[PDB]
Amino acid sequence: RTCLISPSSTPQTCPNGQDICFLKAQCDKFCSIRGPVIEQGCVATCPQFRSNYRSLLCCTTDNCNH
Amino acid sequence: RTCLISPSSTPQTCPNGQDICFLKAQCDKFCSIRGPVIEQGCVATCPQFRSNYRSLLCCTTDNCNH
């Protein structure tokens, strides 16, 4: 499908297998002052939820990861 | 924490030990007369991604499940 991409959050077209879009907010040792580290794009699966995240969003819809 | 709750989406403090809130949405047959079934609450572990799901948001912050 198509999903949004990180930095700029624009559209990009997945390859076969990347049927799912995601938005992932994760925390470094400096989550509290910097903020979480965001990363969106095309995944093939929904990444299992690491304790360090402020949140995961996994959606099958184009550009749904926003 | 206090997470948003399904039928009505009023905040409710997770039973001590449940810190992550989630928002789920899948379609059923009336997925065109109403839209997807939306279920939101408190959990222990973020739910397993499930193919037949329109979306699944797992966040750890108050009433974020929205």
Side-chain angles (χ1 to χ4, degrees):
Chain A
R1 21 175 87 278
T2 17
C3 295
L4 267 294
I5 64 146
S6 334
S8 58
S9 272
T10 74
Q12 98 161 179
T13 315
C14 307
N16 99 130
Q18 309 191 284
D19 51 287
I20 307 158
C21 301
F22 71 82
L23 175 75
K24 160 175 78 191
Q26 102 190 214
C27 289
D28 37 351
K29 152 180 340 211
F30 297 33
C31 207
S32 65
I33 313 97
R34 271 153 141 250
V37 158
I38 286 84
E39 144 168 43
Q40 346 134 84
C42 298
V43 61
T45 354
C46 183
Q48 282 329 285
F49 199 74
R50 254 145 36 164
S51 237
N52 65 5
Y53 310 132
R54 168 85 50 89
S55 68
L56 234 200
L57 180 40
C58 274
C59 57
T60 51
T61 279
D62 320 317
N63 292 213
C64 58
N65 61 339
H66 77 277
Chain B
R1 8 197 82 280
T2 301
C3 277
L4 261 278
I5 239 84
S6 104
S8 181
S9 331
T10 358
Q12 183 80 19
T13 136
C14 299
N16 142 69
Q18 258 139 29
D19 36 354
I20 139 149
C21 295
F22 58 113
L23 202 171
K24 180 189 331 193
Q26 40 179 354
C27 272
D28 52 332
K29 276 359 192 206
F30 297 125
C31 204
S32 89
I33 279 26
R34 147 245 297 164
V37 200
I38 271 158
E39 156 192 68
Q40 53 206 158
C42 288
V43 303
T45 118
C46 174
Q48 268 328 262
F49 196 57
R50 180 24 71 61
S51 14
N52 43 263
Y53 278 172
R54 157 136 345 196
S55 59
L56 178 76
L57 168 85
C58 263
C59 53
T60 63
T61 272
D62 283 356
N63 318 183
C64 60
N65 64 338
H66 60 332

PDB file of all heavy atoms in Angstrom, chain A residues 20 45-46 48-49 51 53-61 64, chain B residues 20 45-46 48-49 51 53-61 64:
ATOM      1  N   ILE A  20       1.297  -3.328   5.831  1.00  0.00           N
ATOM      2  CA  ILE A  20       0.970  -2.535   7.015  1.00  0.00           C
ATOM      3  C   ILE A  20       1.801  -1.263   7.272  1.00  0.00           C
ATOM      4  O   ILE A  20       3.027  -1.296   7.160  1.00  0.00           O
ATOM      5  CB  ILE A  20       1.159  -3.418   8.248  1.00  0.00           C
ATOM      6  CG1 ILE A  20       0.385  -4.729   8.127  1.00  0.00           C
ATOM      7  CG2 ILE A  20       0.847  -2.659   9.514  1.00  0.00           C
ATOM      8  CD1 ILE A  20       0.943  -5.820   9.039  1.00  0.00           C
ATOM      9  N   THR A  45       5.007  -6.675   9.244  1.00  0.00           N
ATOM     10  CA  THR A  45       4.386  -7.159  10.466  1.00  0.00           C
ATOM     11  C   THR A  45       4.253  -5.957  11.356  1.00  0.00           C
ATOM     12  O   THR A  45       4.744  -4.912  10.970  1.00  0.00           O
ATOM     13  CB  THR A  45       5.352  -7.973  11.196  1.00  0.00           C
ATOM     14  OG1 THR A  45       6.519  -8.111  10.387  1.00  0.00           O
ATOM     15  CG2 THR A  45       4.715  -9.278  11.512  1.00  0.00           C
ATOM     16  N   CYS A  46       3.601  -6.087  12.515  1.00  0.00           N
ATOM     17  CA  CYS A  46       3.528  -4.981  13.459  1.00  0.00           C
ATOM     18  C   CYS A  46       4.574  -5.340  14.510  1.00  0.00           C
ATOM     19  O   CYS A  46       4.439  -6.345  15.203  1.00  0.00           O
ATOM     20  CB  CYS A  46       2.185  -4.854  14.178  1.00  0.00           C
ATOM     21  SG  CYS A  46       2.015  -3.422  15.325  1.00  0.00           S
ATOM     22  N   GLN A  48       6.463  -5.971  17.671  1.00  0.00           N
ATOM     23  CA  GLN A  48       6.109  -6.299  19.021  1.00  0.00           C
ATOM     24  C   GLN A  48       6.514  -5.096  19.858  1.00  0.00           C
ATOM     25  O   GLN A  48       7.631  -4.521  19.688  1.00  0.00           O
ATOM     26  CB  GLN A  48       6.961  -7.503  19.444  1.00  0.00           C
ATOM     27  CG  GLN A  48       6.524  -8.903  18.918  1.00  0.00           C
ATOM     28  CD  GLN A  48       5.018  -8.988  18.733  1.00  0.00           C
ATOM     29  OE1 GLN A  48       4.255  -9.091  19.724  1.00  0.00           O
ATOM     30  NE2 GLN A  48       4.548  -8.875  17.469  1.00  0.00           N
ATOM     31  N   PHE A  49       5.591  -4.765  20.772  1.00  0.00           N
ATOM     32  CA  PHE A  49       5.636  -3.613  21.694  1.00  0.00           C
ATOM     33  C   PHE A  49       6.731  -3.586  22.810  1.00  0.00           C
ATOM     34  O   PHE A  49       6.540  -4.154  23.897  1.00  0.00           O
ATOM     35  CB  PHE A  49       4.202  -3.384  22.229  1.00  0.00           C
ATOM     36  CG  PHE A  49       3.950  -2.025  22.806  1.00  0.00           C
ATOM     37  CD1 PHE A  49       3.815  -0.942  22.016  1.00  0.00           C
ATOM     38  CD2 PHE A  49       3.830  -1.840  24.153  1.00  0.00           C
ATOM     39  CE1 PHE A  49       3.533   0.307  22.565  1.00  0.00           C
ATOM     40  CE2 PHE A  49       3.588  -0.579  24.735  1.00  0.00           C
ATOM     41  CZ  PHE A  49       3.432   0.491  23.947  1.00  0.00           C
ATOM     42  N   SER A  51       8.953  -2.237  25.786  1.00  0.00           N
ATOM     43  CA  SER A  51       8.642  -1.458  26.996  1.00  0.00           C
ATOM     44  C   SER A  51       9.034   0.037  26.952  1.00  0.00           C
ATOM     45  O   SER A  51       8.379   0.888  27.581  1.00  0.00           O
ATOM     46  CB  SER A  51       9.262  -2.145  28.233  1.00  0.00           C
ATOM     47  OG  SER A  51       8.292  -2.464  29.244  1.00  0.00           O
ATOM     48  N   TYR A  53       8.530   2.133  24.588  1.00  0.00           N
ATOM     49  CA  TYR A  53       7.827   3.031  23.697  1.00  0.00           C
ATOM     50  C   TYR A  53       6.735   3.818  24.370  1.00  0.00           C
ATOM     51  O   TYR A  53       6.078   3.353  25.286  1.00  0.00           O
ATOM     52  CB  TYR A  53       7.200   2.370  22.461  1.00  0.00           C
ATOM     53  CG  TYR A  53       7.948   1.421  21.526  1.00  0.00           C
ATOM     54  CD1 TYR A  53       7.351   0.238  21.164  1.00  0.00           C
ATOM     55  CD2 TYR A  53       9.154   1.748  20.881  1.00  0.00           C
ATOM     56  CE1 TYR A  53       7.925  -0.610  20.242  1.00  0.00           C
ATOM     57  CE2 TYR A  53       9.773   0.827  20.056  1.00  0.00           C
ATOM     58  CZ  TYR A  53       9.123  -0.323  19.737  1.00  0.00           C
ATOM     59  OH  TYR A  53       9.614  -1.223  18.835  1.00  0.00           O
ATOM     60  N   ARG A  54       6.488   4.998  23.841  1.00  0.00           N
ATOM     61  CA  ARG A  54       5.489   5.834  24.341  1.00  0.00           C
ATOM     62  C   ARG A  54       4.289   5.438  23.529  1.00  0.00           C
ATOM     63  O   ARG A  54       3.151   5.820  23.867  1.00  0.00           O
ATOM     64  CB  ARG A  54       5.933   7.193  24.016  1.00  0.00           C
ATOM     65  CG  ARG A  54       4.917   8.254  24.184  1.00  0.00           C
ATOM     66  CD  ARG A  54       4.762   8.857  25.640  1.00  0.00           C
ATOM     67  NE  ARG A  54       6.023   9.286  26.287  1.00  0.00           N
ATOM     68  CZ  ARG A  54       6.580  10.498  26.191  1.00  0.00           C
ATOM     69  NH1 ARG A  54       6.031  11.450  25.426  1.00  0.00           N
ATOM     70  NH2 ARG A  54       7.718  10.735  26.853  1.00  0.00           N
ATOM     71  N   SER A  55       4.500   4.636  22.472  1.00  0.00           N
ATOM     72  CA  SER A  55       3.382   4.154  21.623  1.00  0.00           C
ATOM     73  C   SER A  55       3.698   3.673  20.273  1.00  0.00           C
ATOM     74  O   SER A  55       4.581   4.192  19.631  1.00  0.00           O
ATOM     75  CB  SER A  55       2.295   5.173  21.343  1.00  0.00           C
ATOM     76  OG  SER A  55       2.897   6.121  20.549  1.00  0.00           O
ATOM     77  N   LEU A  56       2.856   2.699  19.888  1.00  0.00           N
ATOM     78  CA  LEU A  56       2.817   1.966  18.613  1.00  0.00           C
ATOM     79  C   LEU A  56       1.391   2.184  18.081  1.00  0.00           C
ATOM     80  O   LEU A  56       0.452   2.399  18.846  1.00  0.00           O
ATOM     81  CB  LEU A  56       3.039   0.491  18.817  1.00  0.00           C
ATOM     82  CG  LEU A  56       4.164  -0.038  17.969  1.00  0.00           C
ATOM     83  CD1 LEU A  56       3.968  -1.502  17.871  1.00  0.00           C
ATOM     84  CD2 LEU A  56       4.230   0.559  16.597  1.00  0.00           C
ATOM     85  N   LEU A  57       1.303   2.234  16.755  1.00  0.00           N
ATOM     86  CA  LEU A  57       0.110   2.476  15.948  1.00  0.00           C
ATOM     87  C   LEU A  57       0.399   1.629  14.735  1.00  0.00           C
ATOM     88  O   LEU A  57       1.410   1.900  14.040  1.00  0.00           O
ATOM     89  CB  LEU A  57       0.147   3.877  15.385  1.00  0.00           C
ATOM     90  CG  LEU A  57      -1.095   4.122  14.533  1.00  0.00           C
ATOM     91  CD1 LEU A  57      -2.312   3.486  15.208  1.00  0.00           C
ATOM     92  CD2 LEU A  57      -1.399   5.499  13.917  1.00  0.00           C
ATOM     93  N   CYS A  58      -0.449   0.631  14.487  1.00  0.00           N
ATOM     94  CA  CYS A  58      -0.288  -0.247  13.330  1.00  0.00           C
ATOM     95  C   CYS A  58      -1.644  -0.286  12.656  1.00  0.00           C
ATOM     96  O   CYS A  58      -2.631  -0.707  13.283  1.00  0.00           O
ATOM     97  CB  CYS A  58       0.087  -1.644  13.778  1.00  0.00           C
ATOM     98  SG  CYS A  58       1.875  -1.877  14.018  1.00  0.00           S
ATOM     99  N   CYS A  59      -1.691   0.190  11.407  1.00  0.00           N
ATOM    100  CA  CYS A  59      -2.931   0.280  10.621  1.00  0.00           C
ATOM    101  C   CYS A  59      -2.798  -0.090   9.113  1.00  0.00           C
ATOM    102  O   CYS A  59      -1.854   0.385   8.435  1.00  0.00           O
ATOM    103  CB  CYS A  59      -3.470   1.675  10.732  1.00  0.00           C
ATOM    104  SG  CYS A  59      -2.182   2.817  10.174  1.00  0.00           S
ATOM    105  N   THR A  60      -3.738  -0.928   8.614  1.00  0.00           N
ATOM    106  CA  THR A  60      -3.811  -1.425   7.223  1.00  0.00           C
ATOM    107  C   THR A  60      -4.752  -0.478   6.489  1.00  0.00           C
ATOM    108  O   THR A  60      -5.915  -0.684   6.523  1.00  0.00           O
ATOM    109  CB  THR A  60      -4.577  -2.698   7.254  1.00  0.00           C
ATOM    110  OG1 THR A  60      -5.764  -2.428   7.960  1.00  0.00           O
ATOM    111  CG2 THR A  60      -3.882  -3.801   8.068  1.00  0.00           C
ATOM    112  N   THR A  61      -4.245   0.592   5.885  1.00  0.00           N
ATOM    113  CA  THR A  61      -5.033   1.598   5.224  1.00  0.00           C
ATOM    114  C   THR A  61      -4.026   2.574   4.646  1.00  0.00           C
ATOM    115  O   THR A  61      -2.961   2.701   5.181  1.00  0.00           O
ATOM    116  CB  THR A  61      -5.889   2.344   6.179  1.00  0.00           C
ATOM    117  OG1 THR A  61      -7.065   1.575   6.451  1.00  0.00           O
ATOM    118  CG2 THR A  61      -6.283   3.753   5.571  1.00  0.00           C
ATOM    119  N   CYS A  64      -2.360   5.477   6.777  1.00  0.00           N
ATOM    120  CA  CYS A  64      -3.147   5.557   7.949  1.00  0.00           C
ATOM    121  C   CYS A  64      -2.246   5.915   9.125  1.00  0.00           C
ATOM    122  O   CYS A  64      -2.719   6.550  10.060  1.00  0.00           O
ATOM    123  CB  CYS A  64      -3.878   4.278   8.125  1.00  0.00           C
ATOM    124  SG  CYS A  64      -2.645   3.044   8.205  1.00  0.00           S
TER     125      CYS A  64
ATOM    126  N   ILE B  20      -0.890   0.433  30.128  1.00  0.00           N
ATOM    127  CA  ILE B  20      -0.943   0.836  28.800  1.00  0.00           C
ATOM    128  C   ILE B  20      -2.368   0.730  28.446  1.00  0.00           C
ATOM    129  O   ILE B  20      -3.099  -0.141  28.879  1.00  0.00           O
ATOM    130  CB  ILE B  20      -0.183  -0.119  28.058  1.00  0.00           C
ATOM    131  CG1 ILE B  20      -0.874  -0.445  26.768  1.00  0.00           C
ATOM    132  CG2 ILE B  20      -0.030  -1.313  28.883  1.00  0.00           C
ATOM    133  CD1 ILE B  20       0.222  -0.787  25.683  1.00  0.00           C
ATOM    134  N   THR B  45      -0.083  -6.002  28.649  1.00  0.00           N
ATOM    135  CA  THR B  45       0.753  -6.087  27.457  1.00  0.00           C
ATOM    136  C   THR B  45       0.004  -5.654  26.136  1.00  0.00           C
ATOM    137  O   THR B  45      -1.215  -5.881  25.975  1.00  0.00           O
ATOM    138  CB  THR B  45       1.632  -7.378  27.492  1.00  0.00           C
ATOM    139  OG1 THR B  45       1.352  -8.270  26.397  1.00  0.00           O
ATOM    140  CG2 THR B  45       1.390  -8.088  28.811  1.00  0.00           C
ATOM    141  N   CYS B  46       0.686  -4.919  25.256  1.00  0.00           N
ATOM    142  CA  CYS B  46       0.036  -4.441  24.043  1.00  0.00           C
ATOM    143  C   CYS B  46      -0.394  -5.675  23.292  1.00  0.00           C
ATOM    144  O   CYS B  46       0.352  -6.665  23.236  1.00  0.00           O
ATOM    145  CB  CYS B  46       1.012  -3.670  23.190  1.00  0.00           C
ATOM    146  SG  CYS B  46       0.256  -3.232  21.609  1.00  0.00           S
ATOM    147  N   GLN B  48      -1.601  -8.419  20.474  1.00  0.00           N
ATOM    148  CA  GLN B  48      -0.951  -8.920  19.299  1.00  0.00           C
ATOM    149  C   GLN B  48      -1.572  -8.374  18.019  1.00  0.00           C
ATOM    150  O   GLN B  48      -2.821  -8.382  17.905  1.00  0.00           O
ATOM    151  CB  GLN B  48      -0.899 -10.451  19.315  1.00  0.00           C
ATOM    152  CG  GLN B  48       0.385 -11.014  19.950  1.00  0.00           C
ATOM    153  CD  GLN B  48       1.679 -10.135  19.748  1.00  0.00           C
ATOM    154  OE1 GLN B  48       2.509 -10.398  18.839  1.00  0.00           O
ATOM    155  NE2 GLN B  48       1.877  -9.130  20.637  1.00  0.00           N
ATOM    156  N   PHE B  49      -0.730  -7.889  17.079  1.00  0.00           N
ATOM    157  CA  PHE B  49      -1.334  -7.432  15.857  1.00  0.00           C
ATOM    158  C   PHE B  49      -2.137  -8.553  15.209  1.00  0.00           C
ATOM    159  O   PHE B  49      -1.869  -9.773  15.344  1.00  0.00           O
ATOM    160  CB  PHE B  49      -0.504  -6.633  14.885  1.00  0.00           C
ATOM    161  CG  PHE B  49      -1.370  -5.914  13.877  1.00  0.00           C
ATOM    162  CD1 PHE B  49      -2.353  -5.035  14.313  1.00  0.00           C
ATOM    163  CD2 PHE B  49      -1.292  -6.181  12.516  1.00  0.00           C
ATOM    164  CE1 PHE B  49      -3.170  -4.382  13.416  1.00  0.00           C
ATOM    165  CE2 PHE B  49      -2.124  -5.518  11.611  1.00  0.00           C
ATOM    166  CZ  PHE B  49      -3.055  -4.640  12.086  1.00  0.00           C
ATOM    167  N   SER B  51      -4.145  -9.376  11.702  1.00  0.00           N
ATOM    168  CA  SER B  51      -4.395  -9.138  10.302  1.00  0.00           C
ATOM    169  C   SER B  51      -5.722  -8.423  10.026  1.00  0.00           C
ATOM    170  O   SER B  51      -5.769  -7.343   9.397  1.00  0.00           O
ATOM    171  CB  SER B  51      -4.471 -10.519   9.667  1.00  0.00           C
ATOM    172  OG  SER B  51      -4.592 -11.511  10.677  1.00  0.00           O
ATOM    173  N   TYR B  53      -7.455  -6.397  11.277  1.00  0.00           N
ATOM    174  CA  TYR B  53      -7.713  -5.245  12.090  1.00  0.00           C
ATOM    175  C   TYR B  53      -7.502  -4.037  11.297  1.00  0.00           C
ATOM    176  O   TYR B  53      -6.470  -3.936  10.713  1.00  0.00           O
ATOM    177  CB  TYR B  53      -6.663  -5.190  13.188  1.00  0.00           C
ATOM    178  CG  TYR B  53      -6.903  -6.057  14.398  1.00  0.00           C
ATOM    179  CD1 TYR B  53      -5.900  -6.194  15.388  1.00  0.00           C
ATOM    180  CD2 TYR B  53      -8.078  -6.756  14.575  1.00  0.00           C
ATOM    181  CE1 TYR B  53      -6.089  -6.975  16.548  1.00  0.00           C
ATOM    182  CE2 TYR B  53      -8.252  -7.581  15.708  1.00  0.00           C
ATOM    183  CZ  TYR B  53      -7.256  -7.680  16.665  1.00  0.00           C
ATOM    184  OH  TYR B  53      -7.428  -8.443  17.771  1.00  0.00           O
ATOM    185  N   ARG B  54      -8.377  -3.060  11.411  1.00  0.00           N
ATOM    186  CA  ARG B  54      -8.209  -1.804  10.693  1.00  0.00           C
ATOM    187  C   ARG B  54      -7.083  -0.952  11.268  1.00  0.00           C
ATOM    188  O   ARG B  54      -6.388  -0.223  10.516  1.00  0.00           O
ATOM    189  CB  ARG B  54      -9.524  -0.996  10.647  1.00  0.00           C
ATOM    190  CG  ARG B  54      -9.315   0.505  10.434  1.00  0.00           C
ATOM    191  CD  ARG B  54     -10.313   1.019   9.413  1.00  0.00           C
ATOM    192  NE  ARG B  54     -10.908  -0.124   8.703  1.00  0.00           N
ATOM    193  CZ  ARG B  54     -11.598  -0.093   7.552  1.00  0.00           C
ATOM    194  NH1 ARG B  54     -11.859   1.039   6.896  1.00  0.00           N
ATOM    195  NH2 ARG B  54     -12.045  -1.231   7.058  1.00  0.00           N
ATOM    196  N   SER B  55      -6.979  -0.989  12.608  1.00  0.00           N
ATOM    197  CA  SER B  55      -5.980  -0.288  13.426  1.00  0.00           C
ATOM    198  C   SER B  55      -5.814  -0.861  14.882  1.00  0.00           C
ATOM    199  O   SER B  55      -6.612  -1.675  15.356  1.00  0.00           O
ATOM    200  CB  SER B  55      -6.079   1.254  13.335  1.00  0.00           C
ATOM    201  OG  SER B  55      -7.368   1.743  13.743  1.00  0.00           O
ATOM    202  N   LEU B  56      -4.711  -0.499  15.543  1.00  0.00           N
ATOM    203  CA  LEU B  56      -4.387  -0.950  16.892  1.00  0.00           C
ATOM    204  C   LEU B  56      -3.345   0.043  17.345  1.00  0.00           C
ATOM    205  O   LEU B  56      -2.246   0.109  16.769  1.00  0.00           O
ATOM    206  CB  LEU B  56      -3.729  -2.330  16.900  1.00  0.00           C
ATOM    207  CG  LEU B  56      -3.308  -2.863  18.278  1.00  0.00           C
ATOM    208  CD1 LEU B  56      -4.488  -3.342  19.023  1.00  0.00           C
ATOM    209  CD2 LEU B  56      -2.277  -3.959  18.189  1.00  0.00           C
ATOM    210  N   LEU B  57      -3.771   0.847  18.314  1.00  0.00           N
ATOM    211  CA  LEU B  57      -2.964   1.887  18.942  1.00  0.00           C
ATOM    212  C   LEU B  57      -2.755   1.465  20.403  1.00  0.00           C
ATOM    213  O   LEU B  57      -3.716   1.183  21.204  1.00  0.00           O
ATOM    214  CB  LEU B  57      -3.623   3.250  18.910  1.00  0.00           C
ATOM    215  CG  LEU B  57      -2.848   4.180  19.834  1.00  0.00           C
ATOM    216  CD1 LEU B  57      -1.574   4.894  19.222  1.00  0.00           C
ATOM    217  CD2 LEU B  57      -3.811   5.154  20.519  1.00  0.00           C
ATOM    218  N   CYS B  58      -1.465   1.418  20.716  1.00  0.00           N
ATOM    219  CA  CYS B  58      -0.958   1.057  22.022  1.00  0.00           C
ATOM    220  C   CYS B  58      -0.108   2.263  22.526  1.00  0.00           C
ATOM    221  O   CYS B  58       0.958   2.567  22.007  1.00  0.00           O
ATOM    222  CB  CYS B  58      -0.141  -0.240  21.815  1.00  0.00           C
ATOM    223  SG  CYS B  58      -1.042  -1.789  22.190  1.00  0.00           S
ATOM    224  N   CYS B  59      -0.625   3.039  23.462  1.00  0.00           N
ATOM    225  CA  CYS B  59       0.185   4.131  24.029  1.00  0.00           C
ATOM    226  C   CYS B  59       0.213   4.090  25.645  1.00  0.00           C
ATOM    227  O   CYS B  59      -0.697   3.531  26.271  1.00  0.00           O
ATOM    228  CB  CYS B  59      -0.300   5.429  23.495  1.00  0.00           C
ATOM    229  SG  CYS B  59      -1.999   5.282  23.882  1.00  0.00           S
ATOM    230  N   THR B  60       1.254   4.645  26.296  1.00  0.00           N
ATOM    231  CA  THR B  60       1.379   4.648  27.784  1.00  0.00           C
ATOM    232  C   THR B  60       1.366   6.079  28.347  1.00  0.00           C
ATOM    233  O   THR B  60       2.384   6.650  28.721  1.00  0.00           O
ATOM    234  CB  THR B  60       2.689   4.043  28.055  1.00  0.00           C
ATOM    235  OG1 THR B  60       3.719   4.878  27.497  1.00  0.00           O
ATOM    236  CG2 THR B  60       2.725   2.726  27.334  1.00  0.00           C
ATOM    237  N   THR B  61       0.195   6.680  28.383  1.00  0.00           N
ATOM    238  CA  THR B  61       0.076   8.056  28.765  1.00  0.00           C
ATOM    239  C   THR B  61      -1.396   8.167  29.044  1.00  0.00           C
ATOM    240  O   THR B  61      -2.127   7.195  28.875  1.00  0.00           O
ATOM    241  CB  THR B  61       0.553   8.939  27.695  1.00  0.00           C
ATOM    242  OG1 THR B  61       1.953   9.164  27.833  1.00  0.00           O
ATOM    243  CG2 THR B  61      -0.109  10.211  27.785  1.00  0.00           C
ATOM    244  N   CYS B  64      -4.729   8.153  26.301  1.00  0.00           N
ATOM    245  CA  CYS B  64      -4.126   8.444  25.056  1.00  0.00           C
ATOM    246  C   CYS B  64      -4.863   7.649  23.939  1.00  0.00           C
ATOM    247  O   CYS B  64      -4.998   8.064  22.801  1.00  0.00           O
ATOM    248  CB  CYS B  64      -2.630   8.116  25.168  1.00  0.00           C
ATOM    249  SG  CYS B  64      -2.298   6.397  25.559  1.00  0.00           S
TER     250      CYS B  64
END
